[model samples]
Target chain A: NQFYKPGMLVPVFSAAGLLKNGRYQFLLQQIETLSLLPTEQYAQLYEALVYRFVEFVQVLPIRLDEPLCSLMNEGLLRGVNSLNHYIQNHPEATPLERYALFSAGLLLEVAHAVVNQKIFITDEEGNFIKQWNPFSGPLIDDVETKHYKIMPLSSYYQRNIPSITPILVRQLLPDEGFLWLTSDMRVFSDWMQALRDDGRFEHVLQLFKHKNIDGLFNTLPALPVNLQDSPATAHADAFLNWLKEALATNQIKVNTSDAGVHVIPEGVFLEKTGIFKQYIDLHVNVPVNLFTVYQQFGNLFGLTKLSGIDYRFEQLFDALKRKSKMGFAGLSPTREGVLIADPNLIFTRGEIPSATYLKL
Target chain B: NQFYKPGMLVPVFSAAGLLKNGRYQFLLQQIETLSLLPTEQYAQLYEALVYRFVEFVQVLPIRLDEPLCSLMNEGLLRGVNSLNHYIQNHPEATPLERYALFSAGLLLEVAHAVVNQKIFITDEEGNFIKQWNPFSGPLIDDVETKHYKIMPLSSYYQRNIPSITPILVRQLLPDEGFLWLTSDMRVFSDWMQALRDDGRFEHVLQLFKHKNIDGLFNTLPALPVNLQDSPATAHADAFLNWLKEALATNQIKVNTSDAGVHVIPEGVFLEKTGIFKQYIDLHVNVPVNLFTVYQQFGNLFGLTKLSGIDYRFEQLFDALKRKSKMGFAGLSPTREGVLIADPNLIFTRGEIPSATYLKL
Candidate 1:
């Protein structure tokens, strides 16, 4: 009768599955039904997808309110219009090409929408809540700016989304009782502290003492695969301990590739960075665009292409596969959900763990 | 023997004239010879251009120093490569197309280089001198930034170059004694003061009292055509007075359109602004490019074009003819040059004059 649980096993689907064979509306119906959760509840499961981009489609527990939903509605209209325009112009384009165009239009819309949507973070108990403000620091002074922590899609920087990353997850679910997997968490305590000291964060001591959110990026700072027994390895060890605990309790289930899981390696991230650097270097004044992305991954999903870009097709294909994973793993579905331990039990160590899994 | 006179009739040419047949080296040689000005001298004429863009090729009194010239050298190499690439790919492209492509590459290079060069403003007597620092307040403090008042080509804003405009000329020459015509001077003393009060200028009082550069925008502020007998007419009166004075003394001879004189009317300036606004409105995230300019100007100097932009072709042709004027009426070349009066008699009136000549 009840799908809501303290811990839930939220099923993750790929865009391919959700959009295939008349299944879209049925999957959407399942998500709509989950909205039966109490309106007062702060946390709710979502019908989400796996894409390298830090984004998700919310369906369960609650739908986006009118003000927020209006943007997505406009996005769909614009996306459809764009697809129509592209097809009209590119009459000889292939089905794959059309699909890729539709996907970019759709994904870019979501990317743009979240820039206007504020991300609200809270503990599982919903006792503590704070909006995730990026770059402008910890406390928002009601500056009435459209630019929130959600990076604007145009900038196209790597660290656009703070949601679902260990940077936020480590603070919200600060206990060994929970586990969150990520490609890699590069945002470190030192970097965050540096941001704070530079006045990017406000009321720092008060936030830590009262709000209990230190804003220190701790879950798992990754190390390059080659580094061994390095001083920075301490950040990796914490996540290793959490992984062992989760595995020991038989609570972990790595999503099969069939589920469209995207577990990116640090090496791939570095490769993408180099590609961006090269493009920016050559076209000093040009902004990052589809052309820039195509250079790194060739024609992605047959959506975009230029003749000389196929040299990196293999890496791009691998990245596409790795980027398609569930953005989040929600609470377990059964009543006998995972244990919730106090924060002090796990973070007693001075250092955060390195993401050993991301080392691959 | 003395090309570096108080007033000189500096010749103005177009990319077409300069790059015509075999005149390129000859024109360049003339500019190089002008660099014979004594090191102590502050003012020297330049072999300038009539492109709508605020840029000039210095050949005569002084050439760009080696450090500055290096960028132009690279620009030429890149320009040649780009031209070659286009020709190789589009072997059927018309000569017009190749010339246009080369012009864009060449012009964009000069635009980029000046973003690194600082404009030194001094009176004809060389008694006072100061560098024009663009947006970061007037006074520069050794901030090792590449961006000077010379606008970077990428931003593509209307007010990129502050050199030839009355915005600087009015202050440097500071007398009805000398007349310098321009497209229009929109940067008002109010605007300049507004910028200064906002801390975009430093040492404001000290600059005016000691340096004698009040940083006020005078000369001629333009008005829209329909407005008549308005409160803003005060600005118009000052320029009319200057025109009458210059015309009476025969100190002014508006260059024949043949020499590539560019006297932009306020109407054209407004039209260009509207075109930019429309493009920016449609593509919210897109930066201005050749396509944006093509929309308003149809095809500029046979350089850039895209279909459907021909609606503005008439206005474009008109603007092109008007924009071909000499960038400067370098201190009249005759020894009995224009009068040199003190700044006090003029600018005593509380208001700056409107550019009545730009009315057409």
Candidate 2:
């Protein structure tokens, strides 16, 4: 025989089944067998039995692919069990408290299922063993695991677990996963954050957390589920890619230059003199002189990286500078005045006056 | 040539016809043609013309049998002419001033019709006038003439005037009279008395009294006229009758038995008791009292003198004493009880309690 002789196993199972099936009307009627007693007395016994049933369901290993496991898999079963457990234990609690617990649990469960599918990114994570793991307590605390954190993920999972059971079966599911998760999570997290941010949570938590077993059970009915995604993990991948892009292009420069300079070799100028004539014909009505030829020659050399004398003719540089300066004075009025004022204008100005110059 | 050039004898007749027939629209339109200038330019001219018309109307005699004479018989026509004459000459006056004069004239005409038909009572001294006239003018130097001051007869007339003109016509012509003789002096007197008694009329009057001419005019456009009888008149009659009854029954008493009891009966207690039963019954259940029987007895005796009383009715006298004692007990239960037990109770017991009693 069992320690307590397994008191009326069928009746107990039937009673639990009524609660599980939401047959509260039948369960209430059945409890009336001991109606001769005060309501509170019968309520206490009913509540105790409900508590035992909840504990049994809590410890039960969620079977894979079974109705119970599938319900738990979608986070529906866990919420139903939690709400039933809360109501069963706190038969004397207010209707508001019972409703709040039921609503919060259903919302949290649905949110948990959605977040697990989207951001957890692996089907393996959706299994009861990997996701819930009763023996392991919570999977989020395993630091070696990628994409999970103890506080936020556990909260995110539990918070939406409540709202999913009653409503998910009736309403059309949201197409977007994050929308569902955040909305469900908001149900409990908003309440939690309100208390914490207002500095009231710590005071209230201290008053509640380590109470007697009965007090703890009663208080748990009012505790909202925590649902917050791991902000750090969610932002990590995008953050690394952004950091690389930022480092690649990190240098800039400042340059200073005067005006009216002719800096080019004579042989190169002669080679590009025809190009200067075409440019002047396209842009201006005047003929191109040695100064214009020198400017165009310098730009072409800079673009092609072919300014070295060794690559062309070595003796051309001194001759080209002198010839271009002389040609500039003879051909352009402004350039000729600048060259007359200072023969070393090429060194002072660094390039042709109107050309774009670098200030590295 | 006549002092005033005779334009069209028909137009002169037409202008008189507009004034006599109450065709303000036609009259104003005709006047507009005479001067297209702004109000400031034509104000003095308009004032002179209006003053001449008023002086003519004031001096114009009517036979006793004439409907206009009957209208003036109750003094309404006199009041209207007086107010009109005052308003028209004040050219710099605002729209409110204009409206006040218009409303005053209209009301006086109504009162004159009402009083002449014997629908309302007139004073024995035969001086029927607006009650606000006292504040409107200076304080009388002779005490004998003060009693003959203008009664608020114009106010009474004003109180009954409707926003729509038809109602005024209906009230004036309830019986046979020339339509032009709607202004009846006796009716004006009764209307003035009614207005004095009416709380709503008094409230409206008070609101308009301190306000500028614009405020008074604004009230005119929205005045209630469809009301079958004059609310102000009814209220005034009821209030006066009530006061008379209160005085006749010797309801007024002095609390000579208590210390710090001034010679004057506390006016607050008198006002409170006068209104208390009616107010309480309207808002909450009436408190049961011993004074109810005494009040019934006083009513049965038809007592006409409150200042002088017979000591033979010991029970009634005791009840009156109890009422006086209760008044000294303070206005509310908490405060009264506090006063009775407090050290300052003796000094403040009967002497007019502080304004704090009003809060209670």
Candidate 3:
């Protein structure tokens, strides 16, 4: 799974154990790989998820890669089912309201589980995956000493995996934590408003007065959902529509300001977020195949490729179409997204050392 | 830094390199460790951030732990400055309004940088940290084969580190992607409403009409912010207030319901979230030191401990105080947060297999 989970790293320790037990061959089974073009000559991007699975499974004592993957997939499936069931029950919700409520549901689920207890993972037979050696203590990464410290098996299992659950939940659900108010009452009107947004304010104060989980769920729980054997896809289309509605509704806003960019020299911006200021200059004047740059650009938010959304290239294509005013050298314009030079503002006067700028 | 970043894993690769380089001695420098007890005997928890830095840096090629830590700190600093600056320029915004606008700015910054180009990292004197080996490629894990694949230096640098930036940014900002409508104009009125919420409607429709980042920023940019050398903190107090206002304003809502819990036999919940259903049984019959359990229970959301906020324990204490009758365990009662059994309701009862539920 390209999706991330806190427990994703637990496989590493498991891998270490498996390797010690001579279970190396099983690790390589069903391994998959792919290379990005033009970029391959420079460096191949590895799916971090896969890298952990195949390589590290070389090391999990019980080969958690399989069971764990199955468990995570199951959780996501359940999440989708919940969403669909919710939509079925509240058929009057608008596209935006549907997602907004779903967002509320997910946030509540996560928060409740966080304070109440963990959301357990089970198999087809409703058995615990860790049943075999559940009693054994597990090693935890000591934050201070960087050592594999030991902890009760249950505690370790409970802590690490849940850390990851949120990320996967986000994959299918909209990431709307910002809208969650710490104080509960403040949300009263918003829920009313969102319901009001959909023109259905029948149960105005019912949900608003909930002070705990039981009170909240008394009115809203998933109706029996005859889910498909598996979810066809994460609510991508639904999520997409929700995002559109959200953006349209200003439930969410985007910052398109220079403040987002560092005040660096024109050519020095990093190719992604989370980069430190310390390495800004290291990338300046750095050379790489343009294709890789294009690929990275497309995958910037770690979405387009992961979520199967084609954001970058299409935008770039449109960008070029608008600015270049030429049919991209004809026949195969994108093939040469290869930085070709264009005239510099139709012959500017200031010390024109270079009369070219790269275009799509 | 409890704050997460995508490149946080890059340290693992760096650690592998550093280990190969035998710089283990320096890895232990400035190491700090803390133990969460009543829980420690069950299993001592380690700080993950500290674990990666002190332990893994032992193996980084250039001991990236130090510089990377410095770099990440710097990025967060810059993010705060941008927020302060924005808040300063738009002083008319309410606390909720200020955070809402900041939320918009952050979302825009992240999205713009994603598709446009990587946001570069620079040093105090404005130089890249990777300046020395600017031309050497780095090794990347291949997703398919589970092998360490090699890639050109620039490509590796660009791809991996930027992956981490978003997490850190989120640590200081709100995770509000749900509010972002994929379609822009959908957001038009909400922004106006948010502004109108504060009764300041001078720039009506000015910001609402923008189609791109440039168009949006034309009307608003960060003015000069005389930031303190370092931010006093990650705006927790401000964020707390923002959350309160947001809740009061209905911008965000909480779901307090059973839907958040899985359909498990009562008493079989995991200690945390993202747990596999398969592991539910393994935890049911499990036993642990009660103190540790309380600690885990308190730190469930991962917030109380990591964010320096007391979430679990206080609530548990309050819950017990509210539900329980006697104050005998007083004077210093919380010390015995040791799950004591409470009596069944006085009189008629279903098969009282266990007439007691644990209380604070």
Listed in order, each prediction's TM-score against the native is 0.19, 0.16, 0.18
What does candidate 3's lDDT look like per residue over B78-176, in tens digits? 223333444445554333333334333322222111221121122222111221111111122211211110011112122222222232222223223
Q: What is the C-alpha lDDT profile of model 2 across B1-360, one tens digit per residue? A: 011110100001112322443333333333333333366533443322333232222211122133222322222333233333433444443332333332333333332322111111112222222111111111122223221111111121222222112223222221222111112211222233322322112332333344422221111011111112222123222333343344345443323332211122111222223232333343344343324422432322222223112101211114345666776633321111011111111221122233222212
What DockQ, between 0 and 1, does each candidate earn? 0.02, 0.01, 0.01
Q: Model 1: per-residue lDDT, tens digit, A1-360?
A: 122221112232233432443333442343233223232320221222111112233212212222222333332323244444544454654333333332333333332323332332322221112333322222223323211111111121122222112222222221221111111011112122222211112232223325343221212111111111212222222222443354345333322222111122211121333323333454455444533343322211111222122111222223233444543332111111011111112222222222122222
Best by lDDT: 1
Ten contiguous residues minimizing lDDT sum, candidate 2 chain B: B4-13
Chain B TM-score in each of the candidates: 0.22, 0.21, 0.20
Model 1, range B1-360, lDDT digits (tens) per residue? 122221111222333433433433443343233223332321221222211122233222222223322333333333344444544445554333333333333333332323333333222221113333322122223333212111111122122222112222222221221111111011111122222211112232223324343211112111111111212122222232443344345343332322111122211121323323333454455444523343312221111222111111222223343344544333211111011111111222232222222222
Model 1: how far is A226 from its true place, Å?
47
* Candidate 3, residue B322: lDDT: 40
Error (Å) of candidate 3 at residue B326 is: 99
lDDT of 1 at A211: 36
Give the Cα error of residue B140 in candidate 3, in Å. Answer: 26
Pitting candidate 1 against candidate 3, the one with the higher DockQ is 1
Native-referenced TM-scores of chain A, all candidate models: 0.22, 0.20, 0.20
